[PDB]
Structure formats: C-alpha cells, structure tokens
Amino acid sequence: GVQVETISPGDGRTFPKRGQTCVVHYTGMLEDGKKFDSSRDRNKPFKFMLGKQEVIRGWEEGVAQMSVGQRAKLTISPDYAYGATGHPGIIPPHATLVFDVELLKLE
Amino acid sequence: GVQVETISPGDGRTFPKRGQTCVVHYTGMLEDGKKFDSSRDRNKPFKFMLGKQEVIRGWEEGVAQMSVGQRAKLTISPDYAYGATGHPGIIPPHATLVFDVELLKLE
C-alpha cells in the first residue's frame, strides 16, 4: 500500500478536497536511497490536480491523507507506482518508491 | 567547525541574546548543490530561541554571531550538524551542510 511517515507537521485539519490543485515539492528516491528526481533542484514546485489521471496511485492516496504544510515520507509499494511495466529510463521493474513530499499549498 | 560568509551587511550592532527568539528565512543545500529545504518557498519563516537546544550546533553558534538584517551562508561541519546519523530520508551521514540564512528580526 502507500505508507505515510510524517516528519514535519502541517495544520492537521486542511486535507486536499477532491478537485483541488496541490503545489508540492518532492524528492523521489529508489528503495536504496537513490535520488532519481527532485523538484527542489528545478526551483519549481509540481502542481497537480487531485482526482484526475495525473499522479501514480500512491500519490493519489498518500497526499490525500496529508494536511497543508505537512512533509512526509511516502513509501509506495510497486503495485501502487509502476512496478509491472516499470518506467523506461530511471524506474526499473517492481521498484518500491520513496517520496519526500512537502505539501506547500492548496489552491 | 562552521564558516560564516556575510552575503548581506547586517545591522552590525544588534546580535542575538541567549534566550531571545530569532526569526529567520533560509534554504538548505548540500556541497553537491542539491537543495533539501526552503522556508521561503513555504512562506513561513523559521522561529527558534537561542540556547534552548531547539536547533543544531552550527545554527546555534553560526546564528549567534549574525547581526540582525544580515544574510549569511553557513557552512556547517557534520559534527556540528548530523555527523553521526544524518537524518533519515533527507540527509545522509557525514554530510556537510550549506544554509542560506537571513536574520529577519528578534523577539
């Protein structure tokens, strides 16, 4: 499933409602800590809308449990990411993904 | 140890007292460029009291010698930061840290 280990607190009340835009800063890494991507390097946060086919299942369930301002370690099991087909390039098959996500704001 | 590089000229006179609240803004990155945190992006300045063990050694000493209004680049050595274990998911062990901290004001 999708794991959520909170490390930094948000407001603990405002959770993204289905249909809102999420502005997050993340760092995705392989099970062995290999940083494969990071929005913090591009200095541009990732803006995705909740509900529509925009994020891998893990992100859909994970972020939905987060509150504005919170930062957590999402450990997404293979079946909730790509796993099967994997992802040409940096995501090998049946890979467990760890995401350091900081929910910046909800619009 | 810890190196302090005065980026912006501060007050030159007002320095933090053991017990006061330092209101700062900062970004954190590693020697290899990679950033890992930024209060500026989340629009919420970091507040902490000096000498109350609310922050790591580097910040404790490095900030203690920063006058108000001053913006400095802190080059904290692992033993003053998280030398032994680092910080799970975000900081690796033995890593040296670079902090762009701006002393906004005191409380």
Ligand SMILES: CC[C@@H]1/C=C(\C)[C@@H](O)[C@H](C)C[C@H](OC)[C@H]2O[C@@](O)(C(=O)C(=O)N3CCCC[C@H]3C(=O)O[C@H](/C(C)=C/[C@@H]3CC[C@@H](Oc4ccc5c(ccn5C)c4)[C@H](OC)C3)[C@H](C)[C@@H](O)CC1=O)[C@H](C)C[C@@H]2OC
């Ligand atoms: C430019 C394109 C466009 C990409 C952008 C907007 C970029 O700007 C953003 C910043 C993405 C990054 O670009 C640097 C980069 O970020 C990663 O590094 C990453 O960190 C990541 O994991 N992210 C991104 C952050 C949210 C979680 C996850 C994601 O959700 O990303 C989404 C993703 C990659 C989903 C897979 C697509 C293929 C499906 O498989 C299918 C499904 C249907 C299919 C086929 C084939 C035919 N059909 C019909 C295959 C998979 O289904 C499990 C799901 C991604 C955001 C898409 O929604 C949108 C895009 O495609 C990815 C490792 C690879 C990704 O792209 C490099």
Ligand SMILES: CC[C@@H]1/C=C(\C)[C@@H](O)[C@H](C)C[C@H](OC)[C@H]2O[C@@](O)(C(=O)C(=O)N3CCCC[C@H]3C(=O)O[C@H](/C(C)=C/[C@@H]3CC[C@@H](Oc4ccc5c(ccn5C)c4)[C@H](OC)C3)[C@H](C)[C@@H](O)CC1=O)[C@H](C)C[C@@H]2OC
């Ligand atoms: C609970 C969440 C709480 C978080 C908040 C309130 C957030 O709002 C604030 C804005 C922090 C940020 O959250 C986005 C985030 O900021 C970083 O990104 C960062 O930039 C950083 O480096 N910062 C923060 C800015 C000041 C300097 C430094 C710090 O000082 O941060 C402090 C820190 C991380 C100290 C370590 C604590 C454990 C000790 O281990 C010990 C030591 C002694 C011990 C034990 C166990 C028993 N004893 C006696 C364990 C380590 O010992 C070297 C030192 C941080 C402010 C903690 O005081 C309080 C928290 O962690 C960290 C990379 C990770 C941290 O998120 C976590």
